[PDB]
Scaffold this active site. Structure first.
Site, PDB file in Angstrom:
ATOM      1  N   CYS A 108      64.582  34.025 -18.217  1.00 47.54           N
ATOM      2  CA  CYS A 108      65.577  33.898 -17.132  1.00 47.54           C
ATOM      3  C   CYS A 108      66.387  32.677 -17.249  1.00 47.54           C
ATOM      4  O   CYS A 108      65.864  31.521 -17.167  1.00 47.54           O
ATOM      5  CB  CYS A 108      64.962  34.017 -15.732  1.00 47.54           C
ATOM      6  SG  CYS A 108      66.154  33.926 -14.326  1.00 47.54           S
ATOM      7  N   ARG A 111      67.155  30.024 -13.830  1.00 46.28           N
ATOM      8  CA  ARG A 111      66.054  29.357 -13.136  1.00 46.28           C
ATOM      9  C   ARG A 111      66.391  28.070 -12.432  1.00 46.28           C
ATOM     10  O   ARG A 111      65.572  27.595 -11.697  1.00 46.28           O
ATOM     11  CB  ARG A 111      64.839  29.179 -14.033  1.00 46.28           C
ATOM     12  CG  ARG A 111      64.036  30.436 -14.199  1.00 46.28           C
ATOM     13  CD  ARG A 111      62.916  30.212 -15.155  1.00 46.28           C
ATOM     14  NE  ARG A 111      63.419  30.002 -16.508  1.00 46.28           N
ATOM     15  CZ  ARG A 111      62.647  29.743 -17.535  1.00 46.28           C
ATOM     16  NH1 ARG A 111      61.354  29.597 -17.322  1.00 46.28           N
ATOM     17  NH2 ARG A 111      63.156  29.644 -18.775  1.00 46.28           N
ATOM     18  N   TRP A 280      72.158  36.875  -8.357  1.00 49.30           N
ATOM     19  CA  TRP A 280      73.568  37.233  -8.567  1.00 49.30           C
ATOM     20  C   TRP A 280      73.875  37.362 -10.081  1.00 49.30           C
ATOM     21  O   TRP A 280      73.144  36.846 -10.909  1.00 49.30           O
ATOM     22  CB  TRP A 280      74.543  36.259  -7.882  1.00 49.30           C
ATOM     23  CG  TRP A 280      74.371  34.856  -8.249  1.00 49.30           C
ATOM     24  CD1 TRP A 280      74.831  34.237  -9.383  1.00 49.30           C
ATOM     25  CD2 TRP A 280      73.708  33.838  -7.486  1.00 49.30           C
ATOM     26  NE1 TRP A 280      74.478  32.935  -9.375  1.00 49.30           N
ATOM     27  CE2 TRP A 280      73.806  32.650  -8.215  1.00 49.30           C
ATOM     28  CE3 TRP A 280      73.058  33.819  -6.244  1.00 49.30           C
ATOM     29  CZ2 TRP A 280      73.263  31.437  -7.757  1.00 49.30           C
ATOM     30  CZ3 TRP A 280      72.509  32.640  -5.798  1.00 49.30           C
ATOM     31  CH2 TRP A 280      72.626  31.459  -6.552  1.00 49.30           C
ATOM     32  N   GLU A 285      76.234  40.318 -18.146  1.00 55.60           N
ATOM     33  CA  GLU A 285      75.302  41.424 -17.883  1.00 55.60           C
ATOM     34  C   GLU A 285      76.077  42.710 -17.609  1.00 55.60           C
ATOM     35  O   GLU A 285      75.644  43.785 -18.040  1.00 55.60           O
ATOM     36  CB  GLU A 285      74.362  41.108 -16.710  1.00 55.60           C
ATOM     37  CG  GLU A 285      73.519  39.845 -16.886  1.00 55.60           C
ATOM     38  CD  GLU A 285      72.738  39.520 -15.612  1.00 55.60           C
ATOM     39  OE1 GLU A 285      71.753  40.224 -15.354  1.00 55.60           O
ATOM     40  OE2 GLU A 285      73.072  38.577 -14.875  1.00 55.60           O
TER      41      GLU A 285
HETATM   42  C1  HEM Z   1      70.405  33.320  -9.320  1.00 54.48           C
HETATM   43  C2  HEM Z   1      70.862  34.381 -10.004  1.00 54.48           C
HETATM   44  C3  HEM Z   1      70.201  34.772 -11.330  1.00 54.48           C
HETATM   45  C4  HEM Z   1      70.811  34.826 -12.517  1.00 54.48           C
HETATM   46  C5  HEM Z   1      72.306  34.525 -12.828  1.00 54.48           C
HETATM   47  C6  HEM Z   1      69.818  35.227 -13.488  1.00 54.48           C
HETATM   48  C7  HEM Z   1      70.070  35.443 -14.836  1.00 54.48           C
HETATM   49  C8  HEM Z   1      69.291  36.263 -15.600  1.00 54.48           C
HETATM   50  C9  HEM Z   1      69.703  37.056 -16.748  1.00 54.48           C
HETATM   51  C10 HEM Z   1      71.136  37.087 -17.386  1.00 54.48           C
HETATM   52  C11 HEM Z   1      68.600  37.695 -17.180  1.00 54.48           C
HETATM   53  C12 HEM Z   1      68.456  38.609 -18.406  1.00 54.48           C
HETATM   54  C13 HEM Z   1      68.950  40.012 -18.116  1.00 54.48           C
HETATM   55  C14 HEM Z   1      69.263  40.680 -19.410  1.00 54.48           C
HETATM   56  O1  HEM Z   1      70.129  40.157 -20.192  1.00 54.48           O
HETATM   57  O2  HEM Z   1      68.655  41.761 -19.639  1.00 54.48           O
HETATM   58  C15 HEM Z   1      67.482  37.363 -16.315  1.00 54.48           C
HETATM   59  C16 HEM Z   1      66.193  37.827 -16.508  1.00 54.48           C
HETATM   60  C17 HEM Z   1      65.154  37.704 -15.600  1.00 54.48           C
HETATM   61  N1  HEM Z   1      65.163  36.959 -14.391  1.00 54.48           N
HETATM   62 FE1  HEM Z   1      66.893  36.082 -13.639  1.00 54.48          FE
HETATM   63  N2  HEM Z   1      68.584  35.415 -12.845  1.00 54.48           N
HETATM   64  C18 HEM Z   1      68.797  35.133 -11.498  1.00 54.48           C
HETATM   65  C19 HEM Z   1      67.856  35.202 -10.472  1.00 54.48           C
HETATM   66  C20 HEM Z   1      66.556  35.652 -10.630  1.00 54.48           C
HETATM   67  C21 HEM Z   1      65.621  35.951  -9.575  1.00 54.48           C
HETATM   68  C22 HEM Z   1      65.896  35.801  -8.060  1.00 54.48           C
HETATM   69  C23 HEM Z   1      64.486  36.322 -10.141  1.00 54.48           C
HETATM   70  C24 HEM Z   1      63.167  36.679  -9.423  1.00 54.48           C
HETATM   71  C25 HEM Z   1      62.691  35.771  -8.564  1.00 54.48           C
HETATM   72  C26 HEM Z   1      64.653  36.371 -11.571  1.00 54.48           C
HETATM   73  C27 HEM Z   1      63.662  36.655 -12.511  1.00 54.48           C
HETATM   74  C28 HEM Z   1      63.950  37.129 -13.769  1.00 54.48           C
HETATM   75  C29 HEM Z   1      63.051  37.954 -14.603  1.00 54.48           C
HETATM   76  C30 HEM Z   1      61.566  38.372 -14.370  1.00 54.48           C
HETATM   77  C31 HEM Z   1      63.850  38.274 -15.839  1.00 54.48           C
HETATM   78  C32 HEM Z   1      63.366  39.099 -17.065  1.00 54.48           C
HETATM   79  C33 HEM Z   1      63.708  40.557 -16.742  1.00 54.48           C
HETATM   80  C34 HEM Z   1      63.038  41.465 -17.704  1.00 54.48           C
HETATM   81  O3  HEM Z   1      62.128  40.987 -18.433  1.00 54.48           O
HETATM   82  O4  HEM Z   1      63.435  42.680 -17.725  1.00 54.48           O
HETATM   83  N3  HEM Z   1      65.934  35.928 -11.833  1.00 54.48           N
HETATM   84  N4  HEM Z   1      67.917  36.423 -15.390  1.00 54.48           N
HETATM   85  C1  LIG Z   2      67.614  38.624 -10.016  1.00 58.09           C
HETATM   86  C2  LIG Z   2      68.354  38.900 -11.298  1.00 58.09           C
HETATM   87  C3  LIG Z   2      69.614  38.362 -11.466  1.00 58.09           C
HETATM   88  C4  LIG Z   2      70.305  38.614 -12.637  1.00 58.09           C
HETATM   89  N1  LIG Z   2      71.541  38.061 -12.751  1.00 58.09           N
HETATM   90  N2  LIG Z   2      69.749  39.381 -13.615  1.00 58.09           N
HETATM   91  C5  LIG Z   2      68.485  39.912 -13.486  1.00 58.09           C
HETATM   92  C6  LIG Z   2      67.818  40.791 -14.560  1.00 58.09           C
HETATM   93  C7  LIG Z   2      68.800  41.866 -15.105  1.00 58.09           C
HETATM   94  C8  LIG Z   2      69.752  42.455 -14.058  1.00 58.09           C
HETATM   95  N3  LIG Z   2      70.158  43.730 -14.617  1.00 58.09           N
HETATM   96  C9  LIG Z   2      69.171  44.264 -15.531  1.00 58.09           C
HETATM   97  C10 LIG Z   2      68.284  43.077 -15.912  1.00 58.09           C
HETATM   98  O1  LIG Z   2      66.906  43.451 -15.779  1.00 58.09           O
HETATM   99  C11 LIG Z   2      66.344  43.885 -17.030  1.00 58.09           C
HETATM  100  C12 LIG Z   2      66.918  45.209 -17.580  1.00 58.09           C
HETATM  101  C13 LIG Z   2      66.334  45.562 -18.960  1.00 58.09           C
HETATM  102  C14 LIG Z   2      65.166  45.028 -19.336  1.00 58.09           C
HETATM  103  C15 LIG Z   2      64.046  45.781 -19.965  1.00 58.09           C
HETATM  104  C16 LIG Z   2      62.873  45.094 -20.284  1.00 58.09           C
HETATM  105  C17 LIG Z   2      61.793  45.750 -20.879  1.00 58.09           C
HETATM  106  C18 LIG Z   2      61.879  47.113 -21.158  1.00 58.09           C
HETATM  107  C19 LIG Z   2      63.051  47.809 -20.842  1.00 58.09           C
HETATM  108  F1  LIG Z   2      63.146  49.128 -21.109  1.00 58.09           F
HETATM  109  C20 LIG Z   2      64.133  47.147 -20.249  1.00 58.09           C
HETATM  110  C21 LIG Z   2      67.780  39.654 -12.308  1.00 58.09           C
END
Ligand code: HEM
Ligand SMILES: Cc1cc(N)nc(C[C@@H]2CNC[C@@H]2OCC/C=C/c2cccc(F)c2)c1
Ligand code: HEM
Ligand SMILES: Cc1cc(N)nc(C[C@@H]2CNC[C@@H]2OCC/C=C/c2cccc(F)c2)c1
Ligand SMILES: C[C@H](O)[C@H](O)[C@H]1CNc2nc(N)[nH]c(=O)c2N1
Ligand SMILES: C[C@H](O)[C@H](O)[C@H]1CNc2nc(N)[nH]c(=O)c2N1
Ligand SMILES: [Zn+2]
Lengths: 411, 407
Positions: A108, A111, A280, A285
């Site tokens: 993420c 963070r 947000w 994305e």
């Molecule tokens: C403040 C706004 C936020 C932004 C701009 C942001 C940005 C991002 C981006 C660009 C990704 C990768 C998505 C991708 O390219 O597939 C991501 C992944 C992730 N974020 Fe954030 N994030 C935000 C807030 C949060 C929040 C509120 C949470 C939960 C408390 C969170 C937890 C995670 C998790 C668990 C992933 C990995 C998702 C996955 O493994 O599929 N993020 N973040």
């Molecule tokens: C809270 C939040 C904010 C933000 N800007 N982005 C995210 C996570 C992003 C938002 N849109 C999709 C993404 O979540 C993960 C999507 C794909 C991941 C994925 C991971 C493992 C297996 C799979 F099939 C897919 C979360």
């Protein structure tokens, strides 16, 4: 042991000691790196160590480690486990837990915001109608008429794993995709399977390019139920380009609120299989992935045609050109409509500041480089040049198999 | 123990077994991943020798033949007596090709088997090194139609008789520490540019001065040589649409030629093995031209395009980056010097990954280096899972010689 990371653009050298608290395994060994692999019921026996680990962390953070209140709380949890087999988090522990799962999210980039997280406690919830309401409220609070606020809603924890709360949607808000008889797809290709499930479950599909899917919600291990988010709760942005007037007639729009609903929050040994969270967007994305993966809306051709780019050789960089214009259009649109969004330059810069601060104040910041570096323009963002260490801390967010693969159908 | 790699765009799943013959260590553990760190006697020699000859004889379909066992014996005998051994030409050619085949960080490996090997094991002096290198440069340049090659100087002995090419690449531009406080030329090369000056080089002090070779023979003090100017094919950089681009005074060289790595074959160490192929466009346009610590010309370009540099969100950097890269490709193409674009090259590595999975049971790949430094997700390697592991024969980094050379 100390581990050093170097930034090759600035020569700044950081020292990780926090990796020493790492517990779970990476997938990697001394003989193989599984750094680019996407995916690399709990007895009393294992549970109290996990509770204890978490509670020692909580109590250190609040500067009460070793206090009576800390000892009494260990005692209290100990007892609850051996008598009911599980335990209940206090409000303060749950909030702390959910913030740290985000803080420890190595994939993420956002963070820097981890300490501003509105926690909604939905552990008194019992039915799918109850979940709907809780989710409508989160969506309204988070949306906030375009001034997005980060938030998470947390439904009852796993018990015997036969009574799980799950959100079947992978994000609270997402567009249908429909596979047509001719082999083409209308709407979002990533969502075809979910969309057949909903249709099977009774949803009447409009069958346009941008239908907001209905929530499919499972309470207490029961069969899932369909609900439609009120449209007035769904902020959408039509996409237009500042210079190119034909952009709008592409018919594109996106939703403002990204909200992950399919992950599992682990805190102190407990498993919250429904914890939809939302923040947000970073513009890429939408503009890179959502619009420009071949496996998604794939609008690159149509956009390059309309810019009259030389399309007859990959070496004109027509794809690269079209991709930048689309991303310009996404940030322009969100900004014009006053819906919160961050560009990839500003988001990677904030992260590096966050990362340095986490090293100074916490002894580290687990970070996954494959995910942190944006999916366009990688090397002109400062994360490209930043060495990172990836490791697993709890509390944590984890993947879980999709619920339609594991659900015992009832009736 | 058998490992699956999935492509998320195609759903193609491949099964890797080749990793079980992985020999060296990655830097990662089960607790910590180091995927994104730049740098994570007679008794060891015979095993290493054996392991290599075993794969060689297997490759020529003569595993466990008279010829095979005879050679294993002959080498076993040479080691016991000399403390080292010599490779046959055929073994050396196979070894060099396989070091490239096993380079987990190289997108261009579809080409691994077209590698012209120049055996310079008979070389004894820097002047000889210089002669071999000029011949390599001319052969590889081929008047613009680039051909892959490696030149291999004599192997390490007692380690105080190393051949090294001190340059990190055969052909690089000079970097100068300036009264101004900023940097003239290539900032990557500052230190080395000063070591040259300090051994007597006559710096012309320009933006694009071709560095002199600093060659070391048999652990001796190193000497200078100017690559004849007519062997260094350079390319003036212009844009197919922007008439003003020319006026930035940009040029690059046609021949990418890494010279600071250590080639290891069957336990033997070749500390001087400069090798060369041809450029992927992004190597010059993204990194060489746009890195902060490089030529860093984005601001100057964005200005000429009159883009709004007020806010990062106009994506002015990104727009300029694309154009700078368009110009690199267009120029090399116009002057008929081989180059590949990142779309074409990653698409090639995908087909090469497939071939290796079916023909060899896998392909070590470092995703972090394979995925281009611009437009990652629109190239197919973005969506391809890769496994990274170290096989031998290999190329390895080595300390910069000056930090080490007893002078
Ligand atoms: C403040 C706004 C936020 C932004 C701009 C942001 C940005 C991002 C981006 C660009 C990704 C990768 C998505 C991708 O390219 O597939 C991501 C992944 C992730 N974020 Fe954030 N994030 C935000 C807030 C949060 C929040 C509120 C949470 C939960 C408390 C969170 C937890 C995670 C998790 C668990 C992933 C990995 C998702 C996955 O493994 O599929 N993020 N973040
Ligand atoms: C809270 C939040 C904010 C933000 N800007 N982005 C995210 C996570 C992003 C938002 N849109 C999709 C993404 O979540 C993960 C999507 C794909 C991941 C994925 C991971 C493992 C297996 C799979 F099939 C897919 C979360
Ligand atoms: C034929 C055209 C070739 C192409 C298009 C190509 C492509 C590349 C690229 C783009 C990189 C990453 C460079 C960077 O970003 O720093 C790289 C690294 C590398 N390639 Fe190639 N390559 C070619 C030929 C060769 C040859 C002939 C060899 C050896 C015989 C080789 C071995 C290596 C090695 C060892 C690395 C990693 C270098 C390092 O770790 O710094 N490649 N390759
Ligand atoms: C043969 C070849 C062809 C090709 N297209 N590219 C390469 C490798 C490229 C040539 N230009 C940059 C790269 O060489 C090495 C780059 C830097 C690596 C490096 C490794 C360790 C430490 C360090 F400071 C730097 C090699
Ligand atoms: C820190 C990180 O390991 C480093 O910046 C890497 C990232 N990816 C790279 N990729 C390529 N092709 N070349 C490089 O020099 C680097 N540098
Ligand atoms: C195979 C590889 O790990 C995978 O496709 C990753 C690469 N990097 C990514 N980076 C982000 N932010 N999101 C992703 O979904 C992916 N996919
Ligand atoms: Zn690893």
């Amino acid at each position: 042991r100390f581990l050093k990371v170097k930034n090759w653009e600035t020569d700044v050298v950081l020292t990780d000691t926090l990796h020493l608290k790492s517990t779970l395994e990476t997938g990697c060994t001394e003989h193989i790196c599984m750094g680019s692999i996407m995916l690399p019921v709990r007895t009393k026996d294992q549970l109290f160590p996990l509770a204890k680990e978490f509670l020692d962390q909580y109590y250190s953070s609040i500067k009460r480690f070793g206090s009576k209140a800390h000892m009494d709380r260990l005692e209290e949890v100990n007892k609850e486990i051996e008598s009911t087999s599980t335990y209940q988090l206090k409000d303060t522990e749950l909030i702390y837990g959910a913030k740290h799962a985000w803080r420890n999210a190595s994939r993420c980039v956002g963070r820097i915001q981890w300490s501003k997280l509105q926690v909604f406690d939905a552990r008194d919830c019992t039915t799918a109608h109850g979940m709907f309401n809780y989710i409508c409220n989160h969506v309204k609070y988070a949306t906030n008429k375009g001034n997005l606020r980060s938030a998470i809603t947390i439904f009852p924890q796993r018990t015997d794993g036969k009574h799980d709360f799950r959100v079947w949607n992978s994000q609270l808000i997402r567009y249908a995709g429909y596979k047509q008889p001719d082999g083409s797809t209308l709407g979002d290709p990533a969502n075809v399977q979910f969309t057949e499930i909903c249709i099977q479950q009774g949803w009447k599909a409009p069958r346009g390019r941008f239908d907001v899917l209905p929530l499919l919600l499972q309470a207490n291990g029961n069969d899932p139920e369909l609900f439609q988010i009120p449209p007035e709760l769904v902020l959408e942005v039509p996409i237009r380009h500042p210079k190119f007037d034909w952009f709008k007639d592409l018919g594109l729009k996106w939703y403002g609120l990204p909200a992950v609903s399919n992950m599992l929050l682990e805190i102190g040994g407990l498993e919250f299989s429904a914890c939809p969270f939302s923040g947000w967007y970073m513009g890429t994305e939408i503009g890179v992935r959502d619009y420009c993966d071949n496996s998604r809306y794939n609008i690159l051709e149509e956009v390059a045609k309309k810019m009259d780019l030389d399309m007859r050789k990959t070496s004109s960089l027509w794809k690269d050109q079209a991709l930048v214009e689309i991303n310009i259009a996404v940030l322009y649109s969100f900004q014009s409509d006053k819906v919160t969004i961050v560009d990839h330059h500003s988001a990677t810069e904030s992260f590096i500041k966050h990362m340095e601060n986490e090293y100074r104040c916490r002894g580290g910041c687990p970070a996954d480089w494959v995910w942190i570096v944006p999916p366009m323009s990688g090397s002109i963002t400062p994360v490209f040049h930043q060495e990172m260490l990836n490791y697993r801390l709890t509390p944590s967010f984890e993947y879980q198999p999709d619920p339609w693969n594991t659900h015992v159908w009832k009736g």
